[model samples]
Target: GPMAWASSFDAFFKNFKRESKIISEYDITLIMTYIEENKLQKAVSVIEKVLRDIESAPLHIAVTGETGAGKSTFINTLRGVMKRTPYPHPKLPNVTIWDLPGIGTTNFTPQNYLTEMKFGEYDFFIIISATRFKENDAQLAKAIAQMGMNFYFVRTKIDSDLDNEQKFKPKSFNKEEVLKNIKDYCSNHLQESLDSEPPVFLVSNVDISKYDFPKLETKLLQDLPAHKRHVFSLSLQSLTEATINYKRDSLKQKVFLEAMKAGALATIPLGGMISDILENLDETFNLYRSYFGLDDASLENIAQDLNMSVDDFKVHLRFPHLFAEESLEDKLFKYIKHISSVTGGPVAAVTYYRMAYYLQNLFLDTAANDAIALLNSKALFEKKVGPYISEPPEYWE
Candidate 1:
C-alpha cells in the first residue's frame, strides 16, 4: 500500500514538474517511511545539521598579482561587486574574495610577499598577469606550491590582446591561434620556472562569458569541498546551462529536507494545511528564485544589461507570473487538493509531500530553465559592446 501510495503521488507530481530525474521513487519511499515510523523529529535534526553546515561553510579566495595586472577588476567581476573590501560574493556572503596587496613592489618582493600577505589564510590563490608570466608570478606560484595549496594562474586582458592583434594584422588575425599562442607562452614560461606546468586560464574582465572564464569556474567548482561547492555553484551568475542545472540539482536536495522540517514543526490542530504550506513554500520558492537569478531584481538587472525590456525578457521564461504581487496560497491550495483527491493519502502526509514535490518540480525547474533561456537568448550575444580599450579610463584606476 505504501509503495502504491508513493507511486501515485510521484505520478501526480510528475504532471506539475516534468523532470522525472530529480525526485526518484526511492526518495519518496524514504520520506513516507520516515513519517510512518514516527521519526520525523530525528530526520529534522539531521537535516538541520546539514543545513547549518552548508550555511556556515566558508570559501576564501585570494587574488594577487603585479600592479596593473587587472587583479581588482578580476575580483570585482567574479563576485559582481562594484567595489572590494575583503569582497563578499554579492549573492552568497559566506564566500569571500580577498584582494591581497599587489606583489613585485619594492616593499613586497616575491620572497616576502607570501609571508607579509598571510597566504595561509586563503583556501586557494589566483595569480593574475596582464602580460607574460613574470618571475614574480612564478615565485609566488612556487611558494604557494611549497605550502601545499592549490593555485591557478590567470592571464587577464585577453580581449584587449585580441583587439590589438586584430588591429595590427587584420587579415592574419586568428582568434584561436592568438589564444593558443598566449596560453602556450604562459604555460611554457611557468613550466620553465616551476619545473611543472600549472593550470593557466585566459579571461576577459569585461566579458566573463567568453574565453576561459567558464573553464576557470568549472575548475574551481570541481576542486572545492562538497559543501563549499554547493554554495559556490549557486552563487555563480548562471551564465551556462551547466551552472543552471547545478543550481537546480543542489536546490533539489534541500526541498525534501525542508519539507520534512516543516512537517515536523507543524502543530496545527486542524485545517492548517494551507497556512503550513504557504509558510514553508513561500520562503523556499523565494530562495530558489534568488539562487537561480530569476528574482525580480536580478531579472530587471539582466534585462537592462541585455538592452531588452523586462516584459520582453520575461517572454522566454515559463513562469514569469510567479513574480506577480499576489499570494501563492490560492494556487497552491488548489493544486494540493487536486493531488489529495487523486492520491487518497493522509492529508498531512500529502501536504508535506506536495510541498517538496511542488517546489522541486515547478519552482526550481522553471527558475533554472528561465536562467538558461536568458543565457541562450539571441539578445544576450547580440548586445555585445565594442572592443575594450587596452587600458581602462583613469576613473576606473
Candidate 2:
C-alpha cells in the first residue's frame, strides 16, 4: 500500500485548502457547480481545456548580443543544444530560444535590429556582452524597453576574465572585488543611456552552473506569466538542487487542477472510474517523471553522462517500482478506496482533493528526490572526472 490518509475527512479538508494557486477561485466554483448540477461532460471539457492550455503554453526567449559576445554559446549552454534558428527546447518544443543576429554591424544598426529580428515575437530578450556594455547594446536595450518588453543584460566570459585577473595579480587577487568592479562598470555604462538600470547578470558560457546563471534562470522564470512560468520551469535543465525544488513547487501548484480532472473523469459512466482514475494517475505521474528528467530516455542520457549503466543508475532511485511495466490500477484503486473509507464520501467526491494531496505527497516528492539523488550521484562522479567539467559531455559542442 501507499502512504496513509488523514485520520478523518474533516482534518484532511481543513489542511487541504480548496483554493488553488494555479486556477482562479471563480473557475473552481464553476467546475464545482458543474459537478453539482450533473453537467459532467461540460465540467470535464473545461478542466481538460485548462490542463491543455498549460501544457501548450508557448514561451519564446530571445538571445541577442554584439558579435563575439558568446550569444550562440549562451543559448547552446542554456538549452544544452549545440545550435538553432528558433531553437526549440529538446524536451518542451513549445518553448523556443531565438538566437538573434548580433547588433551594431554596418548593415544591422541598433535602431533596425529589433525590426529585422522580429523582436515582437519574443517574450523576453537577453542582451549579452563579452566585455563592456557598448553604444549598440544600450540602444538595443532602449528600443526593447520602448517596445514595452523585458530584456536582461548579461556579461559573458566572466570566467576567462577572472582567470586572467588571477594570473596577473597573483599577490592581491580578490575574486569578489573583481566581480564587483565588472558589475559596477556595466551598470555605470548602461545607466548613462537609460533612466533606470536594468538587471545585469555576470555569466560564463563555458560554465553556466557558476556565476549569475542560476540567478538569471530564477529571474526569468519569476518575471514570466504564470502559465508560461510553469512551462518554462519544467523545460529548464535541473542544474542545481534549487532548480529541481523549483520545478517540484511549480508542479505542486497544479496538483489541485489535475486532481479535479481525475474527479471529472470519474463522472464518465461507461468506462469504470477505477480505470479512468488509474489512467489519469499514470499520465500525471509520467508527466512528473519527464519534467524531472527521470523518464527512460532522459535517464539513459544522464547515465551515459555519468559513466554508469542505466540499470545501475535505476538502483539509486528512491522509487524503483515507478519504472516497472505494470499497470497502476492496483495501486491507485487501493489509494482511492482508502480515501473514500476515511472521508465517508463517494469515491467521486473524495477523489478531488484527496488525489491532489496524494500526488503532492507521493509522486511529486518521489520524482524530485530521485532527481536530486541522480544529481548528487552525477556530482560525485564529476569530482573524479575533473573540476569545472561538471556539465554533461553532450552539452559541449
Candidate 3:
C-alpha cells in the first residue's frame, strides 16, 4: 500500500508532472508511489519488490479474561468469523487463539483460580476485562509480572455498554469518547498500585477491526521478532476489510522466475520448503510444552499425582469454541490436561487446573477473540466471574 500509482506505468505517468514530494528513509530514496513509474519505473519496481518481500508469517496470541467479558466473541473475529467461532488448524501457518479462565473471582482461591498456567511461554498476554478490574484481575497481573511477560488490556464490547452509559451521562455517546473514558478509568485503577501501567486497548465484540486493533498490531510487531512482524500483521489484516484479500498483494518472484525457467518443479519446491519450516515448529512448541510441563516425561502420571479423573480433567470445563465441529480444542485440551497432571503436584493441582482453565480463557480475553458460545446468555464468560475454565490448566494434565 505504500505506492499509489507505483505499481503501474499508467498511474505513474499521470502523476509525474505534478508537484510531488520525495520522502526518504534509511538511505533508500523514497518517492511517493504516484510518480515513480515515469522515468524510474525500474526504481519503482525495486521499491515495490522490497515491499512485496514480506512472506506470510503466523502469529499465536494468548488471551485472558474473567467470565462475561465476551472473550469468545473476540476470538471469533480474529479467526475470520464475525457471527460464529473459528477453529484452530493443526499445521503451520496456523494461528491459534486460546482463552484463560479468571484467576480469582469467587473465593479468590489462587489454587482453584489458575493452578499451573505458564506465562513465560507466550510472546505476550491479552488481559481483557468487561466492566472493571477487581481483585482477581490484579492477581493475574501480578502473576504475569512475575514471569516477565508482556500483556495488553482489551476492553471488550465498549459500544454496547457505552450506549447505555450515554443515556445517563449524555456525553458518552461518541464511541471514541466512551472508549477513552474506559481506558482512563482502567489506567487510573491500575496506575494507583502498579509500578507501570501498560497499554489497554478498546475493542468491540462485533468488530475487532473497527478500533485501534491495527495500532495494537504495530505495537505487538515492534515487540515481536522482525520475521514475525508481517506474519502477525497479515493475520490481523486478514480479518479487516482493508486486508480481507488473503492473496499476497505483491506478486511472487519465484513464480515469475520459474516461468522463465519453464519448470513446474521449482513451484513445488517452494511448498516443500514450507513444509520443512513447519517441521521445525514442533520442537518450538514442544520446548515450550516441556517447559510448561506438557511433555511426555511430566504428563504421563496425572492420575497418581493429583488423583483426579481424566473425565474430570477433560469435561469439567467445557468452554465452547465457536467452530467446534472441526476444531483442535479437544486435542489441545487433552494436551493441556497432560501438562496440568504432570508438573502440578498435590499442592499445586487445584491451582494449576484452575489456572490452566482460566489462564487459557484469559488468553482468549486478552486477544479479544470469539471462543465463547451462548450458554443461556447469562452465564457470561468474563475475567471476574471464575472464568469458564477451571482446575488450573498448568497441572490438569
Candidate 4:
C-alpha cells in the first residue's frame, strides 16, 4: 500500500516542482529538502508563513490624475478584479486603493494635493491622463518622486482615443502606428516636464487585453516589494489569459500552507482542529472563487455589465460546488478517502492526519482549475462597450 502511495506522491511533486519553477522563478528545493530530511515540522512551519504572509499583507495604491482623465474608470477596472465590491478593494483583503483627488481639481491644487490626500498611505501611485500629458501632471510626478514614492503613468481610454483617430484619419490611420505615436508623444511631454519618463501603461478600461496593460501589470509586480506583490497580483480582475495564469500561480503558492494547516490540525486526535481547518479550507475556496470572479455576486455584476443573463454566465463554470457548503462536506469525504488510498499508514489515525494534508493540496489545485474554467466562462460573455462612452463629468468635479 505504501508502494502505491509513493508513486502518487512522486507524480504530485514532479508536477508541483515544474509549475512552481515557472511561476515564482525559484526551485521548491527548501521544502523538498525538508521532506527528504524528514523535517516535516520545519517544512510545515515555512509553508504556514507562506499562506499567512499572503492573506495579512498590506498594499495601498493611489489612483491619481488630472481632472477629466479616466481615473475613475481605471480604478473601477482594478476594483472589478474582485466582483465583491463594498469590501475595501474587491477581492483583495488588506489591499486598499485610494481614489486620490485630481491635481488641479478644486481644493486639490498641486501644492496642497499630497497633504490633503494623505499620500503617505499609498504604496505606489498610478497617475492617469486621458488627453496629452500636461505641466500639472508632470508636477504631480515630480512631487511624488521628491517624497521617494514610486508611480506609473497610465494613458487611459486608448480605445476611445483610437476610435476618434480612426474616424478623423480613416485613410491615413494604422492602429499600431497611432498607438506608438500616442505613446511617444506622451513620453516626450512627460520627459520634458519632469526630466524623466516614468513607466506608462497605455490602456483602455474596456479592453485590458490590448496595448500596454500587460506591461503595466508586469511592472507593478516587478517594482513592488516581495511581500506586497502577491496582494496586488491576485487583486487584478481576470482580464486576459495571462491574468488568469497569474492568478493561478498566485493561488498555487498558498497550497503548501493550506496543506500544512490541515495536517497540523489532523494530529489533534479529535474532531476539533479538523472542523476548524475544514471551515478555513471552505473560506479559502470561496476566496479562490471570488478572486477569479466566479462567485454569485461577481457573476451577476459581470452579467449585468455585459447585457447577458446570469444563467448564460453560469454555464461556463464547470465546478459549481467549489464554493458551496454541502459541496464542501461531500468533497471532504471524498478527499479523505482519496488521501487514505495514497497515504498508507499502519494505523487508521495515521491516515487521518495524512488525509488532511493531501486534501488541502487537492482542493487548492481543484480551485485553481475551477478559476481557469470561470475565466473561460467570461469569454462567452463578451460584449462591446460603445464608442460613444465619454469621461464622467464627476471625474472633473
Candidate 5:
C-alpha cells in the first residue's frame, strides 16, 4: 500500500536479473545505485557483508549470577525468535544459562562450584546481585578475574528500592530519575570498594521492554567481537520483542546486501536496492517462532502473565487475517505488467529473462506488508533501514 518500497525492489530486480542473468552478481550490488542514479559513488559508509557465506561465531557470553538475579528472564528475553514449533538457536539464548545454586545454601562452596562447572571458556561474566554483593559474589568475581576474562557487576531490583523511597519522597513521573539515583548509588559503591568497574546494564524483567533493553543490546553488539556481534542486536531485539525485531533484522540484511553486490563504493546507498532486491524473496516468518517465545514453557508463561487462556492465544494464532496476507507475487506481477505496458517494455518485462527484478519485490514488499499488517496490529518499517545502512558502520563501538 502507498507504493511500498518492496514493490519498487521487485520491479528493479526483474530488470537486473534479466539483464545480468549470465552473471546475476553484476545486478546483485550495483543495480541499486544505477536506479538511484548515483552510478559514480564508491564505498558505502557501512561495509557490505558477503551475501553468500554467513555462519555462527564462537563467543560465549555468560549472564551468570546467584538466584533471583533476573538472569532467567533476561535469557528468556534474549532468545528473540517468534512462535515456531522448532528452532534450534534463537538470539540471547539459554544455551549456557545455569544456576550456580544459592548463596551459602548449596552443598558446594562458590570457589569449588565454578571450578567444577568449568568457567575458563567463558569470555565475559555478568555477575548479578539483587541487594548487596555477597561473599560469594566477591569470590566468584575474584575467580573470574583470575581466569583473565572481563566481567561486570550489576545490582538488580532497583524498582523495589525506588518504591520504598517513593513512599517517603513522593516522586514525580520520571523512570529515568529513579534509575539514575540507583545507578549513582552503585557507582558510589564501586568507588568505595576500590573496584575498577566496567559499565553495568540495568534491566528489569517485569516489562522486558521498559528497561534499557535496547541500550543493553547495543552494548552486547558493541562489546562482542566482530563476527559474533553481527546478529546480536537484531537477535536480541527479536528475542525481547520478536514482532518488532524480526523485520528489523531482515530488512537490515536485505539493504546491506543490495548495496554490497551493486559495486557502488563511496557510500553505496541502499536507495536503489529497496525496490529491486525484494522482487523475489523467501519469507522468513517461520523463523520468528524461535525468537518470539512460541515454545510451550515460554508461551505458557506469556499466557499466564497476560491473563489469557492458552486456547484463546491459539485461536488468535490460527487467524491470519490480522497477521498475514496474500503473497505479493500474484498482485505484484499484475502491477508490473501494467507498468510495463505503459513503459513500452511490458512484454519484455513480464517475460522470464527480465522477471527477476519483477519477482524481487518480495524482499522489500514482505517487509512493507508486514508493517501494514501489524497496523492491522504491528509494523515492520525496518526495510527503510537497508538503504540507510548501505555503508556499514566503521565499527559498532
Candidate 6:
C-alpha cells in the first residue's frame, strides 16, 4: 500500500467527517491503536461499520424543468444511458435519480414540489433548459432555496445549436463565440428573479464532452457532501475517457477497504473467506460488466446498432472475470479449497489478503480500461448513434 495508501485515502473517514458520537476522538484513538498493534482485522472492522452505515444512506437526485427543456435527456446522460422513474444506479442500487415533470405540472407545483413529488426525498435538484432559463426555473430556485436545498441550472442541447451554426454560418462559425453568447444569455436570464445568480451549465444530452458539461460535473463532485460524492461521481455516464477514469479513481479509493473487509469476513468462518471471496468476486464482476457497458444485452444491442456482430464488438473485451481461463474467483477458490485441506498456516492468510487485493485491483483496472476501449470503438460511429430512438439500456431496471 505504498502508493495505495495516499494522504487522501479517506474512504474510511469520509462519511464520518462530522463531529458525532459514532465517530469521535475516542474512535480516532481506537483506530490508531489498532494500526499500531498491527491489528489489520480490528482496523478494518471500524471500516466495516462505516461502510454499513453509508450503504443504507440512499442518495436521491431530482431532475426537473420545462417539459421540452431536455430534462429527460439530461437524466439519461446522468445515468449513462440511452434510459426511468427513480431508477437506481446499476452499480449502486441504493443511489437513485428521479425523472420529474415540469415545474408547472400539477404533480410538481413549486409550492408542493417537495411533498407532492416527494422532493423531500431528494438530496439535490438539476433544473434543465434546452434554451434560455425561464420564470418556472426561477421559481424552482426560490422554492428550493426556501427549503434550504441546493439546485443546478443546466442549458441543454448546446451541440445541436453548434451544428446549426456550422451548417448555416460556415466560414463565419465560431464555436467559442456561440458558446459565450449562450452562456451570457443564460446567465442574464437566470439573474432576473434571483439575488444570487444560480450556477448555469450548458450541455448536450448526447455529448457531455463540450461546453459547460465538464464544469457542471466538477461543481457537483466538489459541492456534494463527501459521503455522497463517491456515488454521485460513479453514477454519472462516462461521456469522455476522462469520465471513465474518474469512475475508476472513485472506485479504487474503496478497493483496499473492500479487500480487507472480504479477507476479514473469510477468516471469521474458518473456510468462509473462500466462499465470501467467490460471491464477492461474482458481484463485483457483474458491476464491472455494468460499468463498462459490456452486459450481454448491452453488448448485443450496441453490436446490432453498429451493424457489427457481437463477436466483432467483443474483440476488445479484456475483463478477467468475463473468461473462465482468467477468472480470479474460479482459480482462487480451487486453490484455497485445496489449501484448506492442509493445516491452515501463515501462507493461507498471506495468500488470502494479497490475492484479494490483487484481484480487486485487476477487476477495477481492466473494467476501466476496457470501458474506454469500448467507448472508443463506438466513437468510430459517433455521428450515427444519435439523436437516437429510445430503447431500454442493458442495465435498465
RMSD of each: 9.3, 8.0, 21.3, 9.8, 13.6, 9.8
In model 1, what lDDT does residue 141 have?
A: 83
lDDT against the true structure, per candidate, is: 0.69, 0.71, 0.46, 0.64, 0.45, 0.66
2 against 6, candidate with superior lDDT? 2
Report the alpha-carbon TM-score of model 1 versus the true structure.
Answer: 0.71
Clashes of each: 0, 0, 71, 1, 54, 1
On lDDT, the candidate that comes out on top is: 2
How well is each residue in 80-146 modelled by candidate 2, as lDDT tens digits?
Answer: 7712268888877787998776676435666577777887788899888899888678888898888
lDDT of 6 by residue, 1-397 (tens): 2222322133334433231113344544565566556565677788677666544667898887667777666666666660126766666777888887776654456777656777678888888878888787788788888898889988888888999999999999999999999988888877988888777888888778877888777777666655565666567776577677766766654555565565543554334454465565787777767765767777787787768887776664677434354554677566545533442211113455646555565677788887787665665455345565555479962
Badly placed stretches (over 4 Å) of model 4 are: 1-50, 81-87, 90-93, 106-113, 193-197, 261-283, 297-317, 320-397
Candidate that beats the other on TM-score, 1 or 5, i.e. the better one: 1
The number of the candidate with the highest TM-score is: 2
Q: After superposition, how far is residue 280 of candidate 6 from its true place, in Å?
A: 7.3
Better of 1 and 3 by lDDT: 1
Clashes counted in candidate 6 amount to: 1
- For candidate 4, report its TM-score: 0.66
| TM-scores, all models, native as reference | 0.71, 0.73, 0.44, 0.66, 0.50, 0.69
Q: Specify the poorest-scoring 10-residue window by lDDT in model 1.
A: 15-24
Q: Which stretches of candidate 2 lie above 4 Å from their native place?
A: 1-49, 82-84, 106-111, 262-284, 297-308, 322-361, 378-397
> What TM-score should be assigned to candidate 5?
0.50
lDDT per residue as tens, model 4, 1-397: 3333333434444443232222232323565455457565665666566566666888888887655786666776777740111226755557777776666664555656777777787888888889777778888889888898888888888999899989999999889987898888888888887866565678897677789998888777776755566677777777676677666665554553454445533455545445566564676667667676667876787666656787875655554544455566576677667654654321222434454554455655665565565554454333223343344477562
> Which candidate would rank higher by lDDT, 3 or 5?
3
Alpha carbon deviation, residue 259, candidate 3 (Å): 13
